[PDB]
C-alpha cells in the first residue's frame, strides 16, 4: 500500500532533476536565441541555486506545520506551471526567464526538502534505507535524462522552447498522483536552540573543513555541469571537422552511468579502506578529489586534440568526483552528535550552496567575459577563453582535496570530543 507512494516519489524526483538541468542541455541555444553574453548563462543557474538555498530552510520548517502532501502537490504544480509559462517568453524579455528559474528553484526546493521526510516516515527498517537509496539514485539518472531530453527535443522539434514544454506535462500526470496515491502519514525556543547549535558547531574543526570540502565539490559540479556542453560545442566548432545535440546526449549518458559507477566504487572503496585505518572516509574522498583534478586538467590539455580524449577524461573525472557523495554524509554523521545532526545537515547544505554552486556559473561567465573583452573576437578565442575560465575548477577541486585532508587529520580528535560530550 506504501510502495506505490515510494515509486511515485522516485519518479517525481527523476522529473525534478530532469527539469533542473534541462536548461543546460539547450543553454547554448538560449545564449544564441537571446543574444546575450556568458554572464546571463551563468546567471540562470546562479539565480536558480540561490533561490533554492534561500527557500530550503523555510520549506524544511514549514513541512512540520501543515500537510506535507498538500505542500508537495502545490509545489510540483507551481514549478510545472512556471516552467510551462516560461516556455513562451518573448525574445526581448530575458530577465523574466531568470525570474521563472527562481520560481522553479523555490518549487524544487519544496520537493527536495519535503519528500525525504515522507519516505522516512513511510518505512522504518533497512527497507527505509533501500527506499532512500532508490530515491537518491534518481539524481544522476535524472540529470542524464534532463541532458538527453533537452538535446533530443531540440534535435527533433528544431526549437529549444519545446524542451521547457516536455517536463511540466509529465509533472501534471505526476502531481495528480501525489494528491491521490500518496497516503497521508500522521507522523511527528527554536531560534535559541539553532543559535546554540551554530555556536557549538563553529568550535568544531573537522565539520568546518568538511563543509568547505563539500562546498568546493558543489562548486566544481555546478560549474562543470553547467558549462561543459557549451565548451565541447565550441571545441567542435573550432575543430577542423564540422559538426551539437549528439554531444549533449553523450554527456548525459556518461553522466548517468558515471554517477552510478562512481557511487558504487566510492562505497566499495570506503568499505575496503575502513579495515586499514579509521580515517578512511575523508582520505578516500581526498583521493577522489585528486583523482578528479589530474583528470580534469587533462581535458583542458586534450580538448584541442580530439573529442574522444575529452570524453574519456569526462568519464573518469565524473566517476572519481561523484564518488564523494555517499561518503560525505557518513563523514558528517560520524562527528556531529545526534542532538545537533539536523541543524548540522541544514547548515552544511546552506553553506555548500552559498559558497559553491550559487556563484560558480556566474563567476565562470564573468571570467570568460573579462578574458574575451581584452582579446580579439573569434570562435577560437571563445573556446580558449572558456577553457581558461574553466581552468579555475581544478584549483578549487585541489583546495577541496586539501580540506578533506585536514578533515582526516582532525577526524579522530573530533570523534573523541563528540563522544566525550555525549557521555558528559
Amino acid at each position: 500500500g506504501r510502495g506505490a507512494a515510494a515509486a511515485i516519489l522516485s519518479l517525481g524526483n527523476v522529473l525534478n532533476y530532469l527539469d533542473r538541468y534541462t536548461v543546460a542541455g539547450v543553454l547554448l541555444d538560449i545564449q544564441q536565441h537571446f543574444g546575450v553574453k556568458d554572464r546571463g548563462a551563468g546567471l540562470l543557474q546562479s539565480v536558480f541555486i540561490c533561490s533554492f538555498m534561500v527557500a530550503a530552510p523555510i520549506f524544511g520548517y514549514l513541512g512540520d506545520r501543515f500537510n506535507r502532501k498538500v505542500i508537495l502537490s502545490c509545489g510540483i504544480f507551481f514549478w510545472s506551471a512556471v516552467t510551462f509559462s516560461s516556455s513562451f517568453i518573448p525574445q526581448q524579455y530575458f530577465w523574466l526567464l531568470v525570474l521563472s528559474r527562481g520560481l522553479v528553484g523555490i518549487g524544487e526546493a519544496s520537493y527536495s526538502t519535503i519528500a525525504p521526510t515522507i519516505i522516512g516516515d513511510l518505512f522504518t527498517k533497512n527497507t527505509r534505507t533501500l527506499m532512500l537509496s532508490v530515491f537518491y539514485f534518481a539524481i544522476p539518472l535524472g540529470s542524464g535524462l534532463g541532458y538527453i531530453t533537452g538535446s533530443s527535443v531540440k534535435q527533433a522539434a528544431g526549437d529549444w522552447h519545446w524542451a521547457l514544454r516536455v517536463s511540466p506535462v509529465l509533472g501534471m500526470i505526476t502531481g495528480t498522483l501525489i494528491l491521490i496515491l500518496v497516503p497521508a502519514t500522521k507522523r511527528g525556543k527554536a531560534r535559541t536552540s539553532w543559535l546554540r547549535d551554530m555556536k557549538a558547531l563553529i568550535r568544531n574543526r573537522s565539520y568546518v573543513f568538511s563543509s568547505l570540502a563539500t562546498s568546493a565539490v558543489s562548486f566544481a559540479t555546478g560549474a562543470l555541469g553547467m558549462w561543459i556542453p557549451l565548451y565541447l560545442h565550441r571545441a567542435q566548432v573550432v575543430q577542423k571537422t564540422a559538426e551539437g545535440a549528439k554531444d549533449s546526449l553523450i554527456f548525459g549518458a556518461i553522466t548517468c552511468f558515471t554517477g552510478f559507477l562512481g557511487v558504487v566504487t566510492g562505497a566499495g572503496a570506503t568499505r575496503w579502506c575502513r579495515l586499514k585505518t579509521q580515517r578512511a572516509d575523508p582520505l578516500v574522498c581526498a583521493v577522489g578529489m585528486l583523482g578528479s583534478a589530474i583528470f580534469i586538467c587533462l581535458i583542458f590539455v586534450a580538448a584541442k586534440s580530439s573529442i574522444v580524449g575529452a570524453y574519456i577524461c569526462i568519464f573518469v573525472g565524473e566517476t572519481l568526483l561523484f564518488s564523494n557523495w555517499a561518503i560525505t554524509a557518513d563523514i558528517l554523521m560520524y562527528v556531529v552528535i545526534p542532538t545537533r545532526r539536523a541543524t548540522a545537515v541544514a547548515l552544511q547544505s546552506f553553506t555548500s550552496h552559498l559558497l559553491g554552486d550559487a556563484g560558480s556559473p556566474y563567476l565562470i561567465g564573468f571570467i570568460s567575459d573579462l578574458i574575451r573583452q581584452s582579446t580579439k573576437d573569434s570562435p577560437l578565442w571563445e573556446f580558449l577563453s572558456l577553457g581558461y575560465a574553466l581552468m579555475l575548477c581544478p584549483f578549487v577541486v585541489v583546495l577541496g582535496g586539501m580540506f578533506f585532508l585536514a578533515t582526516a587529520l582532525f577526524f579522530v580528535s573530533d570523534r573523541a570530543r563528540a563522544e566525550q560530550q555525549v557521555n558528559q
Partner: nanobody, 126 residues
Framework: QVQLVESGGGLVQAGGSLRLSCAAS????????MAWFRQAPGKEREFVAA????????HYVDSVKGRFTISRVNAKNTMYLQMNSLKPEDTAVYYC?????????????????????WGKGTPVTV
C-alpha cells in the same frame, strides 16, 4: 568478523589487584565500542563497564565506581581493565563484548541485547 579473546582471569587473593585484557584481531578495533559483562552463577549477565570508540567516554556501575579502571590502546587493539580491592561479589565469569560504534549515551545501553559480539569469557574468583 570480529572475535574477542579474554585473558588475565583466574583465581586471585581476596582484595588483590587484577588485570583483564581483551584482544580483537578479526578487524580494526577503532570502530567498536567495547564493554565488560559478568555472569554470576546464580544470576544473569550483568553490566560492569563500557568504553566508546576513542576512549574519551567511559561508563561504570554505581556499585563499582572508584575501584575499577577501564582503558584501551587502539594501536594494538587491546582493552585493559584494572580491578583493585576485590569484593567477594566480584567472583563471576567476565565476558568481553563489542558493538558497532554509535553516538548514543553509553549510560543508556546496558541491556545485554545491544552488544552483538561476545567472547569466551574468563572466570574470576575472589
Amino acid at each position: 568478523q570480529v572475535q574477542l579473546v579474554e585473558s588475565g582471569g583466574g583465581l586471585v587473593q581476596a582484595g588483590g589487584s587484577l588485570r583483564l585484557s581483551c584482544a580483537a584481531s578479526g578487524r580494526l578495533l577503532s570502530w567498536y565500542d567495547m564493554a565488560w559483562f559478568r555472569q554470576a552463577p546464580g544470576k544473569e549477565r550483568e553490566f560492569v563497564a563500557a568504553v566508546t570508540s576513542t576512549g574519551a567516554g567511559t561508563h561504570y556501575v554505581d556499585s563499582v565506581k572508584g575501584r575499577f579502571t577501564i582503558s584501551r590502546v587502539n594501536a594494538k587493539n587491546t582493552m585493559y581493565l584494572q580491578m583493585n580491592s576485590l569484593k567477594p561479589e566480584d567472583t563471576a565469569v567476565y565476558y568481553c563484548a563489542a558493538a558497532n560504534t554509535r553516538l548514543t549515551a553509553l549510560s543508556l545501553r546496558t541491556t545485554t541485547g545491544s552488544w552483538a559480539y561476545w567472547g569466551k569469557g574468563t572466570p574470576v574468583t575472589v
